[PDB]
Structures are given as structure tokens and as C-alpha cells.
Amino acid sequence: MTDRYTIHSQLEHLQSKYIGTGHADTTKWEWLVNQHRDSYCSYMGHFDLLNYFAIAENESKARVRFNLMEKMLQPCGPP
């Protein structure tokens, strides 16, 4: 069964479908995990931050992209 969790959506006031915006009741974990995900897509987005990160290890660029890419699922830790 279930009880009373019927909340499909409501008045389309602004449609903040941009993920990562956040509202008043947004906790520390939520906007820090959006902060880490935006950081990761900007790391692999720019070529040259990915250069800078690949020089610091000896790892190749696809190794660094696969590491950064698999960390985007749960980067900060469990809620």
C-alpha cells in the first residue's frame, strides 16, 4: 500500500528545471553535491583543467575522465 504521498506537481510558477538551483530549504549536502557535479563537468569540459589534472598524476586523460566521471555519482558521500 501507500498513504497520502500523492504530490504530483502544482502551479508552474517559474519551472526551475535547471538542476542545481535550489530553494530556501536546501541543505548543505545538496548544494555541495551540486557544487561538486558542476565542478566535475567543468573539469572535463575545459580541455586545459583536464591537462592540469593529468600532469599532477601520471594518469592519461581517459583515465582522469573515467575517474571524474564515475565520481559524479555520489561525490560527497551518502546523505
Partner: protein
Amino acid sequence: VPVAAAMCVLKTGFLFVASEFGNHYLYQIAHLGDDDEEPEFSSAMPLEEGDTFFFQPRPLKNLVLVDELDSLSPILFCQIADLANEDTPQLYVACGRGPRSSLRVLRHGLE
């Protein structure tokens, strides 16, 4: 070959490798196919205990180097200095990642 970001093998039998750090290269493909000598293995042969198909690395047999295209990436540290007593100064550059790294001296002239 050194590790590449992208490869473009060419009809007319070339192989272009773009090393992400250091120099890029263009090879002529000498023995394509290469179905003669080497211990090749496959997918559906019943090999167990992990990988179990190894290979001994070796120097070039299938490619011959033709062109070394030059690059300074990654310029890690640099100096403008006039150490070689020439009139114009010189660029003393650190470059490369790993065992392919190099110090590179740059002048204004021609080869």
C-alpha cells in the same frame, strides 16, 4: 606508440597519432593485417584465471616513423634568459609529461 588523445588511420595507409603531451607523430603502416607470426588470442577460447593472455612488448614491426610534428605542450616552467651569449634572448622551457619530458630551448631563428 606514445599515448594518444586521438588517432586517425588514413586510407593510403597512414597512421596519425596525436600525443596529448609532447610531440605528435605520423607513421606509415608497413605490415597491415599482421596475421602471420604473433601469438594472437581471442574472446571465446576457454581461458580462465583472469586475463591469462599476455604479450611480450617489442619495438616497431608494423609501423615506421615518418614525421615527428612538434609541440611544446605542456609548458610547465619557462625562463627568458640569454645564457648562450647571443644578442637576442632565448626561451628555456620545461616540457612534456613523464619519460617523454624534455627541456626545450627556443630561439627566434630558422633551422
